[PDB]
Every structure is written in C-alpha cells, then in structure tokens.
Write a protein that holds these residues in place. Structure first.
Motif, mmCIF file in Angstrom:
data_model
loop_
_atom_site.group_PDB
_atom_site.id
_atom_site.type_symbol
_atom_site.label_atom_id
_atom_site.label_comp_id
_atom_site.label_asym_id
_atom_site.label_seq_id
_atom_site.Cartn_x
_atom_site.Cartn_y
_atom_site.Cartn_z
ATOM 1 N N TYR A 1 -4.215 -57.145 -43.904
ATOM 2 C CA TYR A 1 -5.615 -57.419 -43.632
ATOM 3 C C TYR A 1 -5.779 -58.906 -43.361
ATOM 4 C CZ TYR A 1 -5.728 -59.230 -48.380
ATOM 5 O OH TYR A 1 -5.477 -59.945 -49.528
ATOM 6 N N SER B 1 -11.281 -60.945 -46.362
ATOM 7 C CA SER B 1 -11.499 -60.487 -47.727
ATOM 8 C C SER B 1 -12.583 -59.419 -47.806
ATOM 9 C CB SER B 1 -11.855 -61.670 -48.625
ATOM 10 O OG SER B 1 -13.078 -62.257 -48.224
ATOM 11 N N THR B 2 -13.415 -59.356 -46.768
ATOM 12 C CA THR B 2 -14.502 -58.348 -46.751
ATOM 13 C C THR B 2 -13.849 -56.972 -46.715
ATOM 14 O OG1 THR B 2 -15.296 -57.565 -44.615
ATOM 15 C CG2 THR B 2 -15.274 -59.959 -44.954
ATOM 16 N N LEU C 1 -10.883 -56.359 -47.832
ATOM 17 C CA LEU C 1 -10.261 -56.145 -49.132
ATOM 18 C C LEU C 1 -11.291 -55.589 -50.118
ATOM 19 C CD1 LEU C 1 -7.380 -56.622 -50.249
ATOM 20 C CD2 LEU C 1 -8.265 -58.713 -51.305
ATOM 21 N N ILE C 2 -12.530 -56.097 -50.038
ATOM 22 C CA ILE C 2 -13.619 -55.589 -50.862
ATOM 23 C C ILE C 2 -13.852 -54.119 -50.572
ATOM 24 C CG2 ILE C 2 -16.067 -55.842 -51.435
ATOM 25 C CD1 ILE C 2 -14.420 -58.225 -52.328
ATOM 26 N N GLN D 1 -10.501 -51.951 -51.986
ATOM 27 C CA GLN D 1 -10.073 -51.946 -53.380
ATOM 28 C C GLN D 1 -9.831 -50.531 -53.892
ATOM 29 O OE1 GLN D 1 -12.369 -50.643 -55.804
ATOM 30 N NE2 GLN D 1 -13.769 -50.126 -54.129
ATOM 31 N N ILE E 1 -6.536 -49.877 -53.123
ATOM 32 C CA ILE E 1 -5.679 -50.647 -54.014
ATOM 33 C C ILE E 1 -5.481 -49.907 -55.331
ATOM 34 C CG2 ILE E 1 -5.451 -52.818 -55.264
ATOM 35 C CD1 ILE E 1 -7.106 -54.104 -52.985
ATOM 36 N N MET E 2 -6.531 -49.272 -55.836
ATOM 37 C CA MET E 2 -6.444 -48.498 -57.070
ATOM 38 C C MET E 2 -5.970 -47.067 -56.838
ATOM 39 S SD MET E 2 -9.015 -46.064 -57.028
ATOM 40 C CE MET E 2 -9.472 -45.735 -58.727
ATOM 41 N N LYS F 1 1.868 -52.836 -50.573
ATOM 42 C CA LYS F 1 2.040 -54.274 -50.414
ATOM 43 C C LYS F 1 0.869 -54.854 -49.634
ATOM 44 C CE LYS F 1 3.621 -58.128 -51.181
ATOM 45 N NZ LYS F 1 2.557 -58.686 -50.300
ATOM 46 N N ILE F 2 0.290 -55.924 -50.164
ATOM 47 C CA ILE F 2 -0.835 -56.612 -49.542
ATOM 48 C C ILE F 2 -0.319 -57.795 -48.732
ATOM 49 C CG2 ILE F 2 -2.423 -55.866 -51.334
ATOM 50 C CD1 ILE F 2 -2.268 -58.828 -52.344
ATOM 51 N N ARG F 3 -0.738 -57.876 -47.474
ATOM 52 C CA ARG F 3 -0.314 -58.962 -46.607
ATOM 53 C C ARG F 3 -1.527 -59.498 -45.866
ATOM 54 N NH1 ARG F 3 4.554 -60.756 -48.492
ATOM 55 N NH2 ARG F 3 5.993 -58.985 -48.691
ATOM 56 N N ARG G 1 4.939 -62.903 -37.418
ATOM 57 C CA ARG G 1 6.401 -62.943 -37.434
ATOM 58 C C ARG G 1 6.989 -63.147 -38.825
ATOM 59 N NH1 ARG G 1 5.676 -66.220 -32.805
ATOM 60 N NH2 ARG G 1 6.094 -65.114 -30.844
ATOM 61 N N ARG H 1 12.734 -53.294 -45.851
ATOM 62 C CA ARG H 1 13.034 -51.918 -45.456
ATOM 63 C C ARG H 1 11.765 -51.070 -45.436
ATOM 64 N NH1 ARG H 1 17.405 -53.345 -43.179
ATOM 65 N NH2 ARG H 1 15.949 -55.107 -43.045
ATOM 66 N N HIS I 1 -18.883 -65.825 -52.263
ATOM 67 C CA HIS I 1 -17.862 -65.435 -51.303
ATOM 68 C C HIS I 1 -18.212 -66.077 -49.968
ATOM 69 C CE1 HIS I 1 -16.080 -62.973 -48.113
ATOM 70 N NE2 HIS I 1 -15.095 -62.746 -48.963
ATOM 71 N N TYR J 1 -10.650 -54.919 -64.608
ATOM 72 C CA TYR J 1 -11.835 -55.388 -63.898
ATOM 73 C C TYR J 1 -12.760 -54.204 -63.668
ATOM 74 C CZ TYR J 1 -9.682 -53.332 -59.759
ATOM 75 O OH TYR J 1 -9.104 -52.466 -58.860
ATOM 76 N N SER K 1 -15.697 -55.537 -57.822
ATOM 77 C CA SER K 1 -14.919 -56.120 -56.737
ATOM 78 C C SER K 1 -14.952 -57.640 -56.739
ATOM 79 C CB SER K 1 -15.423 -55.597 -55.392
ATOM 80 O OG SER K 1 -15.335 -54.184 -55.326
ATOM 81 N N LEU L 1 -11.324 -60.214 -56.199
ATOM 82 C CA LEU L 1 -10.122 -59.838 -55.465
ATOM 83 C C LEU L 1 -9.301 -61.063 -55.091
ATOM 84 C CD1 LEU L 1 -11.440 -56.937 -53.286
ATOM 85 C CD2 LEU L 1 -10.060 -56.764 -55.309
ATOM 86 N N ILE M 1 -0.929 -59.594 -57.272
ATOM 87 C CA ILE M 1 -0.197 -58.556 -56.549
ATOM 88 C C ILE M 1 1.055 -59.133 -55.897
ATOM 89 C CG2 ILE M 1 -0.375 -56.749 -54.816
ATOM 90 C CD1 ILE M 1 -3.503 -57.051 -55.257
ATOM 91 N N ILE N 1 -2.447 -51.857 -61.414
ATOM 92 C CA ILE N 1 -3.816 -52.051 -60.955
ATOM 93 C C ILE N 1 -4.706 -50.978 -61.570
ATOM 94 C CG2 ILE N 1 -3.197 -50.777 -58.859
ATOM 95 C CD1 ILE N 1 -5.875 -53.542 -59.177
ATOM 96 N N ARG N 2 -5.797 -51.404 -62.211
ATOM 97 C CA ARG N 2 -6.669 -50.481 -62.946
ATOM 98 C C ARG N 2 -8.126 -50.849 -62.683
ATOM 99 N NH1 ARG N 2 -2.795 -46.630 -64.410
ATOM 100 N NH2 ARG N 2 -0.907 -47.842 -64.867
ATOM 101 N N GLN N 3 -8.786 -50.064 -61.836
ATOM 102 C CA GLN N 3 -10.220 -50.196 -61.597
ATOM 103 C C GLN N 3 -10.974 -49.304 -62.577
ATOM 104 O OE1 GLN N 3 -13.091 -51.428 -61.144
ATOM 105 N NE2 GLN N 3 -13.296 -51.458 -58.908
#
Lengths: 429, 152, 50
Positions: free
Chosen positions: A146, A149-150, A152-153, A156, A159-160, A170-172, A182, A192, B57, B97, B100, B103, B110, B122-124
């Motif tokens: 991503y 951050s919006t 990411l909000i 989430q 993410i959970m 994996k977050i990138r 690259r 992998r 933010h 947490y 949101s 993050l 992470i 991770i625990r929401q």
C-alpha cells in the motif's frame, strides 16, 4: 416541475483549475439522459450547480455548500478528501439535508451523524471475499503493498484476518515520491513470495505493473489478487500473454446490454484507456437513486437555510427516511443500505481474472454465501504358496489384489511401483 | 471559552470566525480528529498560529503551514517501543488496540520480525467490548505473557 | 539485430525471460537499440561485441 441538487466537485486547483474532469462530464451526461428519459420521471426535470473545490479545503467548501443550500438544493454529494468529507457530514447533520458519499474513508465510530448514505463497497465485505477466495484457492502466503495510510485504516480488518484464519501477511509501502518498488520486489522475490495483495490506485497499479515488468515476475509461479477496483479501467492488453493468474474483483456489470451501452456512450461523449471509470458510474447511480427516491416520495419544497444558523426543515426527515430504504438496480448491480447506517452491504462482485484470451469472469461473490464459481492393468496369476503367496492377516474381508500377499507379491508390488503399472491378481487355474 | 459538541465543523468554524472577529494572537484546536482537521483548514485559509492538542492524521498531499503540535510523534513512540522490546528480547509480541488510531505506531512493529525475528499476534478487539475475558482466556491458551498495549 | 530486438520484446510480452534463462546471441550488434528495460529482472544474458 424543476428540482436542483448540490454539485460537489473537487479539483487540484478548484475554481482556479480550468481543466474539466471526467466526474463532471459523467454527472452532466447522467443529468441530460435523466431529463430526457421519460421512463422514470413523470413530469419533473432536474437542475444543478457546480462547485469546484480545492483539495483539503473546508472554509471555502462550507462556504459554497451553504451558498448552494441558501440557493436551494435537495441533495448534496461527497468530496474526495477526508477532512472535506467530514465537513460535509457536519454540514448535512447540522443543516438537515440528505447527503451521498461517493468516496469512503473511515468515518468516526461514535459520531451521532447517520443522516447520509454511502454509495461504496464496504471493506468488511471485501475482506470476507478475500478470505473466502484465499480459502477456495488454499492460499497460505500473503503480502499486502500500500501507499496511503488511509487504505491501511480501511485494511486493518485484513490485518486482523489471521485471527479468523491463520495466514502470514507482509506489509509493504512505496513512498509517493518515487514509483520504484525494485527494493520491495527484490525483498518479496527473495522471500519466495509469489502472491501479493494490491490495493493501490490505478496509476499506482500501472506503475507497479511496470516495475514487475522490469523485474520479470511473470511466471506460472505467481498468482495475484488486485483488491483495487480499477483493473478494467487500466489498459492491460500487452500483459495477458504472460500466463500468470491475475485475479481481481469487478463491481461493474457488463452482462446487461443497457449498462454496456451506457459505457460506450460515456466513452464517446468524453471526447477522450478511454474506458469507463468507477467513480463516474458511482455518481451516475447516485444521481439516479436520488432522482427515483424523489419521484417515489410525494413532492417536496426546497428550503433556503442560513449559513450562520440552524433552520429546521419538515420534509427533510421524511425524505431522509425514504432515502434509508432506497432500492435501485444500478450499473454496479444490487444497491442496499442498512436501515441504521448509510453503508452499502449487499452487492455481488464479478470475480474476474486475466488469461491469454483477456479478462474473463471466473465467478461471482455475494455477501449471503461467499464465492460461487499406466492405463493398463497387467494380469498376474498367482498360486498360494507360502511365504511367496499367503493370505493377508487382516480382520477385514479381502478382495482381489488384497486377497493375498507374500514375498513375491510384495516384490511385484515394488516392481509395479517402479514401473507404474497396475496389477490384477487372479487364481492359478 | 467556547463549548462545542463532538464531530462538529459548522459550529466549529462559526465560533472560529467569531473569535477571529474578536481577534486573537493564536488559536487552540479541538480534541476531535475531524473537528481538528476542519480547524486546520480554517487556519490555513486564514493564517493564524494554531495549536493542536490531539494527534492528527496528516496525509502527505495537503499544503499547510500553520499547525503546531506538542503531542509526541507516533513514529517516535514506535521507535522507542521497538528499542525497549529489543532490549527485552521479547520473541513474542501481541498487539492490543481497540481502534484504528495508531496504525502508524504498529506498522514498524509488523516489520520488526523482518528486521529481527519476532513472533507477532495482531489482535483487534471489538469496538463495543467492555468484557474482554473471552479474548483474555483465548490469549491464555496462546501462552502469551510478553504483551504490548496500545491503550488510552 | 532487428529480429533480436523483436524477440526480446516478445520475451517481455509472454514473460519467459528471467534469471533462470541463459541467453546466447550470435549477433555481434547489441547496442544498436536500447536495452535498458532488459537490464533488470536479473536475466542471465551475454553476447559478443567488437
């Protein structure tokens, strides 16, 4: 008669910007066709006013909003910037006017403002679709990239997701100041990893695709999902020959001839990709819904309201109520809102992917149930002679090849395993 | 003193420009994210030193030059907790947490196992939870006792 | 040389150029056309020049 609606349009330089964006083109196209489509409107026509707004502007935004409110409109639109959208929600709650949200970013969880509806796919449904498709494909390696951050909000819940079902993610992040994944692509390939979650913008999707082209992640090893709902809008023809499973979700429906014809009409009148855009269809369906709600309800009178004080409007409450049960089959398909929140929940996604033929539909997802989509046996005759051939010691009834075992029997079992031919055990004559 | 309900921008900017008519050297912002953002817009539109008391933010796409924050930067907190847990060498991490908000101060967490191997959970928690005993005993079956808490 | 450039364009089009592949080209001319996008992906390729 004639009705008017509040036009909310966002630009890099607002009124000082002089280029015309596709959103207002689609808006005016929809307005013209609805004012020309007598299949729905009995005798009423629609009008509007444009309000070009700079990004992240509130004072001028609320100025224009209250100006148009005093001039008198029956509906207002959602901006593309978070704080601007929050200001518009505050306006429509303080000044009781129905509001439509066309771009969704996380609203406050505790605000008392529910006096609006959102025309956008909730990301909880998208997360459930992602989970169910991962389970259907038995996927266990995941990685999400991503830029905002919006997102990411609004991710989430993904993410959970390992709480609902165990999986690695994996977050990138790629900073906007350089479209160069690259190092990131190197990291995932060295890790992998052949499966990436894609949630970025269409331009970001194009540049990451170009980065993948440069780094050559185009093999049968890779199978990808693009959560971002803009793949059809992106030109992808020179990449369908890679042979890589590039799955995705489509809210746009093309099965109906009428929506398809609307798509070519949009393409031709735009005067120039050159393809249908998501937010254009979103605003098209939004204005159609607000029109049909206006018709289904008894006629109502617009009220001029102060920019300095709160004035109550009698028809506003009942109009809002009727908006809460708005039902229309838009271009995106089924549109349903909860009777408590303006969030859209019931919608079916055209689970589509990319192959050598091109973009194809591989299934459909719904909130109700998830995703819906040698040769010769050699004749071996044996004579019961121990320990070469002997009755197998088992408490279950034996049959055919399982009747007997022994030294030579297991020797021929191993030989068949080596040579890959089946055997049919027969009794000595 | 000007008292305003939560999640208001209309009355917010109204009182703001009322004070501007009264005239102040500087303004002090609200405690609500949307309201604070609206005040940021107002102060950028009408140049005045603005103090924000609550973490905001800020997207990296807006032009603004009149915001002043004393709240500790979330990235700094993330670095601090990373360093202290690295000192503690906690091979197990459990994220706590209920919103949101934060993050930015978990993404590096992470990345922490990537930087150096950490077991991460991770625990929401639900936003209406006031009896967290179920998830507590769930974590008890997880044999988790080296826990990080993003909490108010 | 033109055919070699077209072959490499094809290779990106169907996507079977990568580090695993080892490429040997009889052509003595490789700098005539730009090969910049071919650099990345770590593709194993070599040739001759005069």
């Amino acid at each position: 008669h004639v009705i008017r609606i509040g036009g909310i349009f966002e630009y890099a330089d607002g009124p000082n910007a002089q280029v015309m964006n596709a959103e207002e083109h689609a808006f005016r196209f929809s307005a013209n066709i609805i004012n020309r489509n007598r299949t729905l409107l009995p005798n009423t026509t629609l009008t509007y006013d444009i309000q070009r707004i700079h990004f992240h502007d509130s004072f001028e935004a609320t100025k224009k909003a209250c100006d148009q409110l005093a001039l008198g409109v029956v509906a207002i639109f959602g901006p593309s910037q978070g704080s601007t959208t929050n200001a518009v929600q505050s306006i429509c709650n303080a000044l009781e006017v129905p509001h439509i949200q066309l771009r969704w970013k996380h609203h406050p969880l505790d605000n008392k403002d529910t006096f609006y509806v959102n025309l956008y796919p909730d990301y909880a449904s998208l997360s459930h679709a992602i989970l169910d498709l991962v389970q259907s494909l038995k996927w266990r390696s995941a990685t999400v990239v991503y830029d905002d951050s919006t997102g990411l909000i609004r991710l989430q819940e993904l993410i959970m997701a390992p709480s609902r079902y165990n999986i690695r993610l994996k977050i990138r992040q790629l900073p906007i100041d350089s479209d160069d994944s690259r190092p990131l692509l190197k990291e995932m390939k060295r890790g992998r990893e052949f499966r990436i979650i894609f949630d970025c913008s269409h331009t970001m999707a194009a540049q990451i695709l170009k980065q993948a082209m440069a780094m050559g992640m185009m093999t049968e090893y890779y199978h990808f999902i693009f959560t971002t709902l803009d793949l059809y809008a992106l030109d992808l023809e020179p990449y369908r020959y890679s042979g890589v499973n590039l799955t995705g979700f489509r809210i746009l429906n093309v099965d109906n001839p009428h929506v398809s014809a609307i798509v070519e009409k949009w393409s031709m009148e735009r005067l120039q990709d050159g393809v249908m855009m998501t937010d254009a269809a979103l605003l098209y369906d939004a204005v159609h819904i607000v029109s049909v709600t206006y018709q289904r309800a008894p006629q109502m009178t617009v009220n001029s309201l102060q920019c300095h004080r709160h004035k109550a409007w009698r028809f506003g409450g009942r109009f809002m109520n009727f908006i809460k049960e708005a039902q229309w089959e838009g271009l995106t398909g089924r549109i349903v809102f909860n009777k408590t929140s303006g969030l859209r929940t019931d919608f079916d996604l055209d689970i589509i992917s990319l192959k050598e033929d091109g973009l194809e539909k591989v299934g459909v997802w719904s909130p109700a149930d998830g995703l819906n989509i040698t040769n010769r046996s050699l004749i071996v005759t044996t004579l019961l002679e121990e320990p070469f051939v002997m009755f197998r010691k088992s408490d279950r009834t034996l049959y055919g090849n399982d009747r007997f075992e022994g030294y030579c029997i297991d020797l021929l079992k191993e030989l068949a395993h080596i040579l890959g031919f089946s055997y049919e055990i027969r009794l000595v004559e």
